Amino acid sequence: CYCAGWIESRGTNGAQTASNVLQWLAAGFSILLLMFYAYQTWKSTCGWEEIYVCAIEMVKVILEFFFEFKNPSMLYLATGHRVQWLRYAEWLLTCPVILIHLSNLTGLSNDYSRRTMGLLVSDIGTIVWGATSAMATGYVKVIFFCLGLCYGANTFFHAAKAYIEGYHTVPKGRCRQVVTGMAWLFFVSWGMFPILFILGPEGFGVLSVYGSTVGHTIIDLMSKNCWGLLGHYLRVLIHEHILIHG
């Protein structure tokens, strides 16, 4: 198997250095957040969503530092396109959990509405179509990217509805500022996901593998570590409000 499109070049030895540094920073942040969540589960209240997302992010970052360009994480394909399977697998593992966290922002409701079901179905669909577009190499890539755009538009509409509902159910004060910050982080990072797809090697080859890895690491820290930490803080504030007033 030669396929000269496999060797190519992943970066410029400076994007590689930035990617390694950001991977170390993400690993450290995920590890520290995991110890913090373990301590909180021991003492305070803690949700399973943030812990699961942090654990998956830590595992993904370790595998990205070690074997990002190896077969399970990087599919090389007969078309000459190196597909970052690790990215989309981690998306499938985390983003549904992030939206399960988005529903029931206040970690108090035990049940989930059908809007959550539509959210999850649309998100799984949009990640599936994004992966297929990454592996689709051509006009099929454009078709599957547009399918993912439609699914992600539905996902964004449902997520915006969930964010408005959370903003209104949450107590007035610090809680709504935390909800607004969560919404900002969520929408910016989840809208940079398709932007990075377009700019990355999976779309127009502008960002290269290492630059795309750098950008995806940054918005991965934003969308999962920082967003999960803000969700945990929102849950802590809600628990305090329930203890005092409720």
Ligand X SMILES: CCCCCCCC/C=C/CCCCCCCC(=O)O[C@@H](COC(=O)CCCCCCCCCCCCCCCCC)COP(=O)(O)OCCN
Candidates 32, 164, 206, 242: give the one binding ligand X (CB under 6 A): 164
Q: Which is nearer to ligand X, 46 or 145 (CB)?
A: 145
What are the residues whose beta carbons fall under 8 Å from the beta carbon of 229, sequence distance 6 or more? 33, 50
What span, in angstroms and rounded, lies between the C-alpha atoms of 211 and 70?
Answer: 18
Residue 157 as a binder of ligand X (CB under 6 A): the answer is yes
Chain centroid offset of residue 99 CA: 10
CA atoms within a 13 Å half-sphere pointing along the CA-CB vector of 211: 16
Least Cβ distance, residue 9 to ligand X (angstroms): 24
Q: Of these partners, a copy of itself, ligand X, none, which one is at the site of residue 126 (CB under 5 to 8 Å by kind)?
A: ligand X
222 belongs to the binding site for ligand X (CB under 6 A): no
DSSP-assigned letter for residue 171: P
Give every CB contact of residue 246 below 8 A, 6+ residues apart in sequence. Answer: none
Q: In terms of Cα–Cα distance, which of 73, 57, 95 is closest to 10?
A: 73
Selection from ligand X, a copy of itself, none that 79 binds (CB < 5 to 8 A by kind) is: a copy of itself
User: Of 193 and 227, which CB lies nearer to ligand X in the complex structure?
Assistant: 193
Stretch that binds ligand X, among 11-19, 50-58, 154-162, 236-244 (CB under 6 A): 154-162
Task: Say which residues have a Cβ less than 8 Å from residue 174's Cβ, sequence separation at least 6.
Answer: 237
- Decide the pairing of beta strands 74-75 and 83-84: antiparallel
Tokens of 41: 């589960």
Per partner kind, with CB cut-offs from 5 to 8 A, the member of a copy of itself, ligand X, none near residue 191 is ligand X
Residues 69-108, mask of contacts with ligand X (x by CB under 6 A): ----------------------x---x-------------
Residue 191 as a binder of ligand X (CB under 6 A): the answer is yes
Which of 29, 37, 163, 210 binds ligand X (CB under 6 A)? It is 163
CA 133/CA 142 separation, integer angstroms: 7
Query: If you search the block for the tokens 């599919």, which residue do you land on?
Result: 75
Dihedrals phi, psi of 74, to nearest 5 degrees = -125, 110
Q: Which residues bind a copy of itself (CB under 8 A)?
A: 1-6, 52, 71-72, 75-80, 83, 85, 89, 92-93, 96-97, 100, 110-114, 116-117, 120-121, 124-125, 127-128, 131-132, 135-137, 140, 144
* DSSP-H helix ranges across 170-246: 174-199, 208-220, 227-244
* Residues making contact with ligand X (CB under 6 A): 91, 95, 126-127, 130, 148-149, 152-153, 156-157, 160-161, 163-164, 167, 179-180, 183, 187, 190-191, 193-194, 197
